[PDB]
């Protein structure tokens, strides 16, 4: 079952969005595909987790994106994998996994032109959104 998403005084909390955005400096830029993030990864994810634990009442939606040059449909599970990576780190840092939501939107909000692989590398980014 799934507990009804009706939080009386839960949800609206400190601006973790702007807080985490301040550390990330925007979206989560990746530089590895096919394998997992090796040690000496991103201290930012460790930093982000800190404020997510500060207000574990909140819900965070990690949105993953991809380039549109790929086969549509696959982008969904793919970006969902990218987002899961962050969640795993957050949970590993002591953040409540049940309060973290990882989604894969594939190609939705394109940052750069897909004509160039560079832009595609930007488009495959992931963003942490606070509910």
Curated annotation (Swiss-Prot):
It is found in: Secreted, Cell wall; Cell outer membrane. The gene is arfA. Belongs to the outer membrane OOP (TC 1.B.6) superfamily. ArfA family. This is Peptidoglycan-binding protein ArfA. Residues 17-131 form the OmpA-like domain. Disulfide bonds join 13-55. It comes from Mycobacterium tuberculosis (strain CDC 1551 / Oshkosh). The chain holds residues 196 to 326 of 326 of the full protein. Probably plays a role in ammonia secretion that neutralizes the medium at pH 5.5, although it does not play a direct role in ammonia transport. It comes from the Bacteria. The lineage of its organism: Bacteria, Bacillati, Actinomycetota, Actinomycetes, Mycobacteriales.
């Amino acid at each position: 079952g799934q507990a009804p998403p009706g939080p009386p005084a839960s949800g609206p909390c400190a601006d973790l969005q702007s807080a985490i955005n301040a550390v990330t400096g925007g979206p989560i830029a990746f530089g590895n595909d096919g394998a997992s993030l090796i040690p000496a990864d991103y201290e930012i994810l460790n930093r982000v987790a800190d404020k997510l634990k500060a207000c574990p009442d909140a819900r965070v939606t990690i949105n993953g994106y991809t380039d549109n040059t790929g086969s549509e449909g696959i982008n969904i599970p793919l970006s969902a994998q990218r987002a899961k990576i962050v969640a795993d780190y957050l949970v590993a840092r002591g953040v409540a996994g049940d309060h973290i939501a990882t989604v894969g939107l594939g190609s939705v909000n394109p940052i750069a032109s897909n004509a160039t692989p560079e832009g595609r590398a930007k488009n495959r980014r992931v963003e942490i959104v606070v509910n």
